[PDB]
Design a protein around this nucleic acid. Structure first.
Ligand SMILES: COc1ccc(C[C@H]2NC[C@H](O)[C@H]2OC(C)=O)cc1
Ligand SMILES: [Cl-]
Ligand SMILES: [Cl-]
Ligand SMILES: [Cl-]
Ligand SMILES: [K+]
Ligand SMILES: [Mg+2]
Ligand SMILES: [Mg+2]
Ligand SMILES: [Mg+2]
Ligand SMILES: [Mg+2]
Ligand SMILES: [Mg+2]
Ligand SMILES: [Mg+2]
Ligand SMILES: [Mg+2]
Ligand SMILES: [Mg+2]
Ligand SMILES: [Mg+2]
Ligand SMILES: [Mg+2]
Ligand SMILES: [Mg+2]
Ligand SMILES: [Mg+2]
Ligand SMILES: [Mg+2]
Ligand SMILES: [Mg+2]
Ligand SMILES: [Mg+2]
Ligand SMILES: [Mg+2]
Ligand SMILES: [Mg+2]
Ligand SMILES: [Mg+2]
Ligand SMILES: [Mg+2]
Ligand SMILES: [Mg+2]
Ligand SMILES: [Mg+2]
Ligand SMILES: [Mg+2]
Ligand SMILES: [Mg+2]
Ligand SMILES: [Mg+2]
Ligand SMILES: [Mg+2]
Ligand SMILES: [Mg+2]
Ligand SMILES: [Mg+2]
Ligand SMILES: [Mg+2]
Ligand SMILES: [Mg+2]
Ligand SMILES: [Mg+2]
Ligand SMILES: [Mg+2]
Ligand SMILES: [Mg+2]
Ligand SMILES: [Mg+2]
Ligand code: NA
Ligand code: NA
Ligand code: NA
Ligand code: NA
Ligand code: NA
Ligand code: NA
Ligand code: NA
Ligand code: NA
Ligand code: NA
Ligand code: NA
Ligand code: NA
Ligand code: NA
Ligand code: NA
Ligand code: NA
Ligand code: NA
Ligand code: NA
Ligand SMILES: [Sr+2]
Ligand SMILES: [Sr+2]
Ligand SMILES: [Sr+2]
Ligand SMILES: [Sr+2]
Ligand SMILES: [Sr+2]
Ligand SMILES: [Sr+2]
Ligand SMILES: [Sr+2]
Ligand SMILES: [Sr+2]
Ligand SMILES: [Sr+2]
Ligand SMILES: [Sr+2]
Ligand SMILES: [Sr+2]
Ligand SMILES: [Sr+2]
Ligand SMILES: [Sr+2]
Ligand SMILES: [Sr+2]
Ligand SMILES: [Sr+2]
Ligand SMILES: [Sr+2]
Ligand SMILES: [Sr+2]
Ligand SMILES: [Sr+2]
Ligand SMILES: [Sr+2]
Ligand SMILES: [Sr+2]
Ligand SMILES: [Sr+2]
Ligand SMILES: [Sr+2]
Ligand SMILES: [Sr+2]
Ligand SMILES: [Sr+2]
Ligand SMILES: [Sr+2]
Ligand SMILES: [Sr+2]
Ligand SMILES: [Sr+2]
Ligand SMILES: [Sr+2]
Ligand SMILES: [Sr+2]
Ligand SMILES: [Sr+2]
Ligand SMILES: [Sr+2]
Ligand SMILES: [Sr+2]
Ligand SMILES: [Sr+2]
Ligand SMILES: [Sr+2]
Ligand SMILES: [Sr+2]
Ligand SMILES: [Sr+2]
Ligand SMILES: [Sr+2]
Ligand SMILES: [Sr+2]
Ligand SMILES: [Sr+2]
Ligand SMILES: [Sr+2]
Ligand SMILES: [Sr+2]
Ligand SMILES: [Sr+2]
Ligand SMILES: [Sr+2]
Lengths: 56, 237, 73
RNA sequence: ACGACCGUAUAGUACGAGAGGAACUACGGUUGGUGGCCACUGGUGUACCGGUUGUUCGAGAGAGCACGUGCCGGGUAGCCA
RNA sequence: CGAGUGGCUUGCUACCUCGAUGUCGGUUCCCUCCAUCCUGCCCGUGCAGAAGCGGGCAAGGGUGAGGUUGUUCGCCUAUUA
RNA sequence: GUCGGGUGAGAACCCCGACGGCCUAAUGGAUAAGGGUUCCUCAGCACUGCUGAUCAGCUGAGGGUUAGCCGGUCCUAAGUCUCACCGCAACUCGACUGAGACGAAAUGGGAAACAGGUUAAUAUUCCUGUGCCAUCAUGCAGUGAAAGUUGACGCCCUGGGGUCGAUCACGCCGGGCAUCGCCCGGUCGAACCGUCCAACUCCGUGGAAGCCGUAAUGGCAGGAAGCGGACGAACGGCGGCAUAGGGAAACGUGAUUCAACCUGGGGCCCAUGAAAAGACGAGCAUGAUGUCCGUACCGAGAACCGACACAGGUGUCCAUGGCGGCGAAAGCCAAGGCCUGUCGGGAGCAACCAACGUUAGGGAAUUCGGCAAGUUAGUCCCGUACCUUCGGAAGAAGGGAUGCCUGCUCCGGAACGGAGCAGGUCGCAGUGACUCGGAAGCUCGGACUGUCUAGUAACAACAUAGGUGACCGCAAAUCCGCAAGGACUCGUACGGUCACUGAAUCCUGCCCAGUGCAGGUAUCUGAACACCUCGUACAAGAGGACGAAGGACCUGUCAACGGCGGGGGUCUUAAGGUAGCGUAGUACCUUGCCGCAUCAGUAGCGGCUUGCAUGAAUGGAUUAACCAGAGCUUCACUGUCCCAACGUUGGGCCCGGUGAACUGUACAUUCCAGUGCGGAGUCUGGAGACACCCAGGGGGAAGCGAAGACCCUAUGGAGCUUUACUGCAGGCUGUCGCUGAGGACUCUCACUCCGGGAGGAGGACACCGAUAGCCGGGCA
RNA sequence: CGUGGAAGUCUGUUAGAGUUGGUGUCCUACAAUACCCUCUCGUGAUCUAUGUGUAGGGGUGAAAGGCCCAUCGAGUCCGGCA
């Protein structure tokens, strides 16, 4: 079985959903953690300095 | 390189873990204060998934239903006694001090009250030899003379299920089924069949180890493979 | 008794299974009564069809050479 | 757009002690190549005619499907070697 | 021993191509060369004949089927002018 | 698909009818996920639709999903999270232990619903009829009440009960057909309430010394059969439900085989096959309450994933529709669905291509190689070799039979089950299509089933049982973490860790010098702290004394890394190649020599064999069985070949409609020679050349496609190795702190472990913090 | 002789799984791994759905340097970074 087109047919699992905290479709319904704002992981909002260029 | 299989083991992931949720009971000796007046009737003889040997279901006088490490000959209806003044009959648990010399014993304690550590596998037994006010010398299944506290409890008789090692597995499937009930990754791929990246014996144009197999005790995990601190190797000599 | 194994496995593997399973399937004398009615229920578990006596023995034998040594002392 | 070979007569002759053994010429054929043609032989021929298995149309009659003919037998014209 | 011709082998060189000119052998289809294997015409002979050996002109046509081997090469078989 | 017709400005493809087809585990029916309005209606054609469109999954506007009893909700599973505790420089980090919560929508457990009717679209939800569960309230009964049972369970074989379905018989209702009198459809009716009970188990009676019993195992004086009885099943029978419902009508009755469902018997395990909530236990009347969330539609060759209306991918139930046959097989046909695997028109329709049929004579001559194709084929009877681990080999091989029709026999309760007999009889052919092995031998490899490079390798590679060695008594060995801690482990040497070899059979020689590991060690070497000397009003520093692990040295060890020669009738460096096997998948020479086989055999097999450079768990030899593994031979077969022909289907060609891409410095009708950075359509000389267009097979454009994978170069990169350089973890060991009392010793009070506790074991050690020496490709 | 019905047992396009040859078709594809015939397994070390765990010098690996979302001799994203 090829890793391309024939392996795409099994993709009917729901993982990333609309988040209660930020509104982005990044709340992993299995992990119960948001990949965008960090809801479920931290009280503080997920933010990183690498999201922008070093001197900005 | 990459971490070897023995290093992946320690992490304790699913593949390396024992199916604990499928295990019956942690076969330990009963807790008595003194007086010995604790006895019970054997209700059933069950199979223990953890040790491939049988285990006996006993119902005690004070209403306690517990599984006990079954010696050979123990059947339904039989009365077993646990305590100091217990009868010297097969299947009874009493301290090494009260058990006579030259009598085969099993499920021996290391420290008094631990519930039993030694001689628990199928058909094995410890042999009680010398007595004293300080020490009870027991000969363990490996042939080692273990000096123990006479206050260490033990069950009389050899462990049940003897001669299990006598019949061959014949086929891979039989091994598969046994291994699925244990905390072991099976089948075993030889290191010599792997790549250099995966094991110290990996690599080469042909299959052979890259250095001698006898490794030092001081060797770090990732290198300690083959014959660990061997005093000698081979059959002859 | 190893005809189920066919032309596979070899002499020693299927000779030792035939011998062990021959002695396992035999008529064994019961510790309660004296009747030759003991059958295997599983690994190490033995039972008499007469008096319903369920007991512990060897894995394939109802009595091991080491189990008979316990009675002596 | 023809190349080459075998054979018969020449001749058991010329030549030669013998053994052996030609040629000119005239004939018949074979092989390779070449161009064309289908009376003849052969192939095809899901044109056509027949036999027959299974199933469906109630039986019969007569038919459909079974890979582009179910299978089997015969095969006209044409196209072909 | 001396003098050469060829450009099929091998070697030498590093001129051309490394922002790519797809390998060997085989096959299929076309053209060509002559240093001619056969066929035509010849000269010599240690040319009686028959069968040969050697040489000359000559490239019209022909030079086939197979066994081992990927083989080219080569070995082998039976045919063949 | 075709002929009529409908609607429309417009019709090959939108709709009706007829005729003709396609799909049968699906192209039908119900659904999970996923989609999200795609569902229905109306109005449309700018967009989307492989052509067109009046159609539409498109555009726009409206409408549509109704529940005590179907899911959710509740329970607990692997497991997840939160809080507390602890760690960490710290946290959104981290293991344990506690508590709490979360974790199952087809497909785990689970209080209770059936039948009909209705809409454009919902429906066990609405409506009609009937029924049921839980909770609470009132009334009556009851004082029992929690022990127990249930929930609740693996794999294999099998009996019994039994419904739907299917079929058979006969009757009734309706239809079809029209030489017959056959053929098709229907002949209905639930939940629920009540009742019946086979199997199992048990009791009384009885009294078997050989009987009882089964498909099979089995049962019994410890009490068999027989007899009586207690307990006791179906989604089943029976009655009600039902002058309910449904049907145009009749509105059946019996039977066989029996999915569902119920209930038993047997066998297997180095494998042992969830839990919890809940229910029962534990009555009856009447009445009230039963909220919240889901509910449309698709579920796929157009509603999902794959950028697409993608030939891909994607779970469950319908596995019992008819003939057929062993069959959930083929082929054919219903029910149901469809003509949307969605562009058409035309040409005996050429070449050429894809799929394919048939080819006389020859029969592998084809080719690296029988690649491709073909041959064989079902069932019964006869018969069957070498070898073998006695299982197998084996469907070996080889030979015969096979239809229809008439009348019968046997087995069985019977089948619309099976096995046979006699007579008759047709064809070229009776497994008539379909379905359906070609066979035999020698050699190599791996024992076998199994695994693998998702996407050029399925193999001889990996695995395997089996063999072997190593470590460890559990406060262990091995391993993970910075730590707190953790896996192994609900485990304990018949264990499990770390490695090697790789079924069985016969075996497994010699070497411990080097390297590795391990043990020992008079003596030698061996760091730091403390101690002593010198030095310094102190300090730096120099030296000494003592000396751990380690090393030197000695010993053990090869199923530990490995080694098993040159010379001569010892030498290197320990030994000097034993059984075997051998021109090997290992042999350079090499197509070795001899033989087999062939016309011819670098092949293959056998023998020999001085082996360039075989050889014994780096396992040697051998081997039945097995194999999409490598090589060879034979019989059979054939278009692989001699050598090609004709045909079939889809293209190709012409017409309507739709409508890309690759590629493009310029010029360009070339050819032969030459020249040129030595491989020119373009330069030079000649030759040839009127323009444009169609079809073709691909000679050239060193054709198109890709900043060469080869090679080298760069004080480029990465992965990997080691006795490369340098370091970092880790292990071992000494020393200092924790740390206490009286070069060997006693104790207990810190500290550690065991014990529920009392208390026990150990103990100034160990753990931990710090430092020093050694080892240290585990890692950078 | 029968009964019994074992087996990593055999035949099998049962369902399902796999992928040997054709080096066929396709190769600006129906398809960034497809189509067809052929072939292997098909009661077990079997296949499969859903839920769940293991995470990047780390997993996972019957070991092919295989696999970890068309990405693997060290995933992907962004940042270091011009
Ligand atoms: C037989 O070994 C060979 C070696 C090299 C090449 C290729 C080269 N030859 C011509 C150009 O140098 C280059 O062409 C390319 C790369 O397309 C082919 C075969
Ligand atoms: Cl084991
Ligand atoms: Cl639902
Ligand atoms: Cl039964
Ligand atoms: K080049
Ligand atoms: Mg225990
Ligand atoms: Mg496991
Ligand atoms: Mg292995
Ligand atoms: Mg490898
Ligand atoms: Mg390494
Ligand atoms: Mg090897
Ligand atoms: Mg090896
Ligand atoms: Mg070219
Ligand atoms: Mg000449
Ligand atoms: Mg010429
Ligand atoms: Mg409309
Ligand atoms: Mg509907
Ligand atoms: Mg479509
Ligand atoms: Mg022929
Ligand atoms: Mg040839
Ligand atoms: Mg073939
Ligand atoms: Mg009869
Ligand atoms: Mg060979
Ligand atoms: Mg194999
Ligand atoms: Mg191997
Ligand atoms: Mg592959
Ligand atoms: Mg394979
Ligand atoms: Mg092993
Ligand atoms: Mg072993
Ligand atoms: Mg030879
Ligand atoms: Mg040896
Ligand atoms: Mg380049
Ligand atoms: Mg290179
Ligand atoms: Mg580098
Ligand atoms: Mg503790
Ligand atoms: Mg390195
Ligand atoms: Mg999973
Ligand atoms: Mg490799
Ligand atoms: Na020259
Ligand atoms: Na060539
Ligand atoms: Na010539
Ligand atoms: Na040849
Ligand atoms: Na259309
Ligand atoms: Na009933
Ligand atoms: Na198999
Ligand atoms: Na040595
Ligand atoms: Na050797
Ligand atoms: Na043909
Ligand atoms: Na061209
Ligand atoms: Na690399
Ligand atoms: Na028998
Ligand atoms: Na295939
Ligand atoms: Na296989
Ligand atoms: Na990484
Ligand atoms: Sr596929
Ligand atoms: Sr899926
Ligand atoms: Sr979290
Ligand atoms: Sr931040
Ligand atoms: Sr324990
Ligand atoms: Sr305990
Ligand atoms: Sr190696
Ligand atoms: Sr030895
Ligand atoms: Sr003549
Ligand atoms: Sr003569
Ligand atoms: Sr037809
Ligand atoms: Sr046939
Ligand atoms: Sr000339
Ligand atoms: Sr000549
Ligand atoms: Sr050559
Ligand atoms: Sr040669
Ligand atoms: Sr449906
Ligand atoms: Sr229009
Ligand atoms: Sr619609
Ligand atoms: Sr819940
Ligand atoms: Sr459920
Ligand atoms: Sr029945
Ligand atoms: Sr619906
Ligand atoms: Sr599909
Ligand atoms: Sr129909
Ligand atoms: Sr269309
Ligand atoms: Sr014919
Ligand atoms: Sr041949
Ligand atoms: Sr040949
Ligand atoms: Sr025959
Ligand atoms: Sr072997
Ligand atoms: Sr795979
Ligand atoms: Sr062996
Ligand atoms: Sr040594
Ligand atoms: Sr020798
Ligand atoms: Sr063309
Ligand atoms: Sr099988
Ligand atoms: Sr099969
Ligand atoms: Sr191939
Ligand atoms: Sr195609
Ligand atoms: Sr391709
Ligand atoms: Sr083919
Ligand atoms: Sr950057």
């Amino acid at each position: 079985t090829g890793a391309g087109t024939p392996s795409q047919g099994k993709k009917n699992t729901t993982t990333h959903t609309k988040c209660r905290r930020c509104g982005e479709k990044s709340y992993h319904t299995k992990k119960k953690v948001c990949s965008s704002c960090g809801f479920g992981k931290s009280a503080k909002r997920r933010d990183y300095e690498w999201q922008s260029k070093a001197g900005e | 390189g990459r971490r070897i299989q023995g290093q992946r083991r320690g992490r304790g992931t699913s593949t390396f873990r024992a199916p604990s949720h499928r295990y019956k009971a942690d076969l330990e000796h009963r807790k008595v204060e003194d007086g010995d007046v604790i006895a019970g009737t054997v209700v059933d003889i069950e199979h223990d998934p953890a040790r491939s040997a049988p285990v006996a279901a006993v119902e005690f006088e004070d209403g306690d239903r517990r599984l006990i490490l079954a010696p050979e000959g123990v059947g339904v209806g039989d009365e077993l006694q646990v305590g100091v003044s217990a009868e010297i009959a097969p299947g009874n648990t009493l301290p090494l001090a009260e058990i006579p010399e030259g009598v085969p014993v099993c499920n021996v304690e290391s420290s008094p009250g631990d519930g039993g550590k030694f001689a628990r596998a199928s058909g094995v037994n410890a042999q009680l030899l010398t007595h004293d006010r300080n020490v009870a010398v027991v000969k363990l299944p490996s042939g080692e003379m273990k000096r123990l506290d006479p206050q260490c409890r033990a069950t009389i008789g050899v462990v049940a299920g003897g001669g299990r090692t006598d019949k061959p597995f014949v086929k891979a499937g039989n091994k598969h089924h046994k291994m699925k009930a244990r905390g072991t990754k099976w089948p075993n791929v030889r290191g010599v069949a792997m790549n250099a990246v995966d094991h110290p014996f990996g690599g080469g144009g042909r299959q052979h180890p890259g250095k001698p197999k006898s490794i030092s005790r001081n060797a770090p995990p990732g290198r300690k493979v083959g014959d660990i601190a061997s005093k000698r190797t081979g059959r002859g000599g | 008794s190893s005809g189920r194994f066919g032309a596979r496995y070899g002499r020693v593997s299927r000779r030792r299974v035939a011998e062990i399973e021959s002695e396992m399937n035999e008529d064994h004398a019961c510790p309660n009564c004296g009747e030759d009615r003991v059958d295997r229920q599983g690994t190490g578990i033995w039972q008499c069809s007469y008096c319903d006596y369920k007991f512990t023995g060897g894995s394939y034998k109802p009595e091991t050479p080491g189990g008979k040594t316990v009675r002596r002392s």
